Design a protein around this ligand. Structure first.
Ligand code: LAI
Ligand code: LAI
Ligand code: LAI
Ligand code: LAI
Lengths: 296, 295, 294, 293
């Protein structure tokens, strides 16, 4: 329990003010909001935190604030991944300094790197993490890095690796990974297939939509555990109706907008080049916020 | 049942040493599947090596399977070809032979517009003369990538009664189920059967059902009973087998296991498919024994 | 002589009932010859062979041979997914007196590279002496071959050429660099000029049916070191290709040919649909332009 | 005039992965000496994506001090972030670059409209310097249609397009639609064919060690000497074959190191070192190039 990384953890968003600068008050409220809905932990500084349109110092600032707000209360995973190994190492040392429970890193992107280079990249970050377990992060759709099962097996067995965030819709691979690593902490990465992901082998998940309805994902975990398939499907379907909308509106901004209507986020903007939410979607987003507040 | 829902084996086509149809083995395979308690057979699809068969050879298999199983279990005739006319001929034959439904893969190789795909299905449905159509979506092999909206349009065409979804995208699987509560939805990838059912599929069609269809039936039952553990254990056992078959070559691997099961006389596939690597025989034979002892 | 040159990928004319239109097929073969084409690639994608039966494909090979054997080079595309069916057509090509055979990498089902190699060997054997033209067209076949695999295929006993339907001109140059004597056909009409510069020494294409002389002109222009003419000719070809892609290439070509009094009924076989009527004016005008220019 | 053959500049680092200023200056001078028309700075080749904003600005400033007025200078200021890209654009303006450039923002999916506004914002910050749109789908993962490219190149303030695409049909279509557009061929290995299809120049990594060869191809084609153009392209490709095997940036730095231009041939991690089995060929290539011209 004190070291268990298994569970449902929200990929934290980064609230910005009207000038696109970090909105500290809103970030703090969002952390507390997540804690209150029973989330098992937070995954900070990942794609959802818009880490790739932030500087290193901005990412460290977010990590420090989240730790001050949640260290101890819930599990905290710091995504310290950058294309550069040196930058990733800096964030890793900061994560340990702030007291995070683990670090994570997306496979470095843009430039093509050999598998050996990817491996050494993880080794170097693990070294700088000084004891904090590493969560390998596989997300081919965004990184453009396509790993084979054998390569995934090598990565998750590297000394210091304690988990894999599997953002892949391939549930054959999900099952194969579980079969080869019975003890590996395996996070389902695509919210829209959470239930099927757990059935295939995942033992938890990390996702953007958990910020506004994490309790539903927890409900799916419970349902499957109790053999209540109908309830598991019902909850997954409700999550997917929401995901359908967010994909149309733009996921991060759609989520921030809902959080704004829930009195959590002051200004629902994402950083440029991300544009604002199209006015035509506001009625549905407001209705959703209203519904989630009633439900919860 | 008065519907097409269920676990249907994608029938293999046994050939002799000369690569000609082995009628005796074909009949044995049909009975073997029926004896296993399968709900039906999907005939003339990818698994039956239809794409390396002539139109007359595909029709011959449809006739024989009909003679062997008509009225005992459901029979779906995959009549799809790149050509609409050839597909129509097979549809007319499926009708004459008494099949319960027809099916057709999205025409491939040549790029066709969505409207052309729709007209293709409409034409085949016309020739099916009343038999419901099972749209067949298999992007990995066809090269045809349909959007959810296009799939929705296809499954709502007059005469369509089901969709064989050979896609590993379980978000789309759920979306399809959500938009079509009554649609017969077959999971196409054996290796994700359990997850596919959980996502919304209400049955499945697969190649490996030929040697262990009861396991898939067991997964259906396990989920219906809310026994997640048993569903996972069974899926895992199926995947261990699928891992092997992918290494050996799926069709020939299955035919080889069937050979050791005293069903298929000669486990060959048609060229360009090559033979099974001898180094795999020990494992395939052990699997055959394991499956037999399991029954 | 050899197989180098500009060969038109022959279309298969059909009547209103989608049956082979022999009269029009013969007219198209004679038409191409009159354009000064070096040869014909028969039974390939452009001939709508993948929506024809073995018997129908054989009939087309037999008829084209009767019409052009000895006048121009004839390459029979005998490729099918099935090796056996491919061999049957190979044997027929030999019987009818074609100059060479060709086969697209078998598609739909995934085959190991070894199975692809054995497939070509089997067909080469049935071709009974006729040289094999390997056909690489990943866009349509879904088969992605590495450079090493292509090198292996082109060096198989009996292989005398490669139809490279790929827009990767780096690979085109690499292939030429590794095989200085290989007959290498550029496959995408829209990059013909650049394809030749990269290493191709000829080409096979669908649009050669209505303007083969333009491609022959590009070959001449580059050979004379006249780059601007080569570019001008390529640009004109691409303006037409832009249109044919909008209308649908095969039916667009057949429609133009119809307006040229060559093809009676410009229909393709289903699932191919008819040409959108809104394109007729442009296609008819193009037909007018091409006849005058020639 | 931005038309021409311009080297995508590499960024030399020392043993501790820090900027090697002296080698950066030497490489700039080396390029000027081999007759390059200009330099493309801070792009993929400069390892900009494993550098911080301040580090990228430092390189822009040093290169400007070394070559402003001597050769054309294009600053690639592109980042995923619009704000960051704008900061670099303003710097490029301050340092006196002739133009700015920006790769289509990557990793996160962006709508075409967002891509357009991204460019507009950077163009605004460039305060006068023309924008060179940078299309490189293989690395960015952003696939643009011909129509979208036409829209981008017609944006106010856009004066060129670096086309890192092997699609020469599209290359011809772009030229046909834009007779006066400065169009740079981006893949060195198809340079000759790219020019024939419509490109009127190029920007490439290998220009750092054999830019004169590309200049020769331009000359050969302009003179109608197809044979020489092909010969030069073949020699370039033999080299590119090797570089792809060794790793392009590190292979180039190693050659430059053997030419005594670059002190330490390392790229920043995660890039690894060159496999020693390739040193004999790289040394031989450096020897050949030095004795060649
Ligand atoms: O929407 C994004 C993606 O479709 C993802 O859900 C799939 O790739 C699942 O296989
Ligand atoms: O092996 C075949 C395939 O990987 C299949 O399992 C996946 O496509 C599902 O995403
Ligand atoms: O238009 C069709 C294709 O894009 C073709 O020109 C390209 O594949 C060649 O690079
Ligand atoms: O090698 C790099 C790439 O393969 C490049 O040559 C191709 O994309 C060109 O079409």
């Amino acid at each position: 329990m004190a070291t268990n990384l298994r569970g449902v953890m929200a990929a934290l968003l980064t609230p910005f003010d009207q000038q696109q600068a970090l909105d500290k008050a809103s970030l703090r409220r969002l952390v507390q909001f997540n804690i209150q809905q029973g989330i098992d932990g937070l995954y900070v500084g990942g794609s959802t935190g818009e880490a790739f349109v932030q500087s290193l110092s901005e990412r460290e600032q977010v990590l420090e604030i989240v730790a001050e707000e949640a260290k101890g209360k819930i599990k905290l995973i710091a995504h310290v991944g950058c294309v550069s190994t040196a930058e990733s190492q800096q964030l890793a040392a900061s994560a340990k300094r702030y007291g995070f429970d683990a670090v994570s890193a997306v496979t470095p992107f843009y430039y093509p790197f050999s598998f050996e280079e990817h491996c050494d990249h993880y080794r170097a970050i693990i070294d700088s993490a000084d004891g904090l377990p590493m969560v390998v992060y596989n997300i081919p759709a965004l990184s453009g890095v396509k790993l084979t099962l054998d390569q995934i097996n090598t990565l998750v067995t590297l000394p210091g690796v304690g988990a894999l965030k599997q953002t892949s819709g391939d549930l054959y691979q999900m099952e194969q990974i579980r079969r080869e690593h019975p003890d590996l902490v395996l996070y389902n990465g695509y919210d829209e297939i959470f239930a099927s992901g757990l059935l295939a082998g995942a033992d938890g998940g990390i996702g953007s939509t958990y910020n506004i309805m994490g309790w539903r994902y927890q409900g799916i975990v419970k349902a499957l555990k109790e053999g209540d398939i109908q309830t598991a499907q019902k909850l997954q379907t409700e999550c997917n109706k929401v995901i359908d909308l967010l994909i149309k509106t733009g996921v991060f901004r759609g989520l921030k907008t809902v959080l704004h209507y829930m009195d959590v986020v002051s200004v629902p903007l994402c950083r440029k080049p991300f544009g604002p939410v199209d006015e035509k979607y506001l009625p549905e987003l407001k209705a959703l916020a209203q519904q989630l507040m009633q439900e919860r």
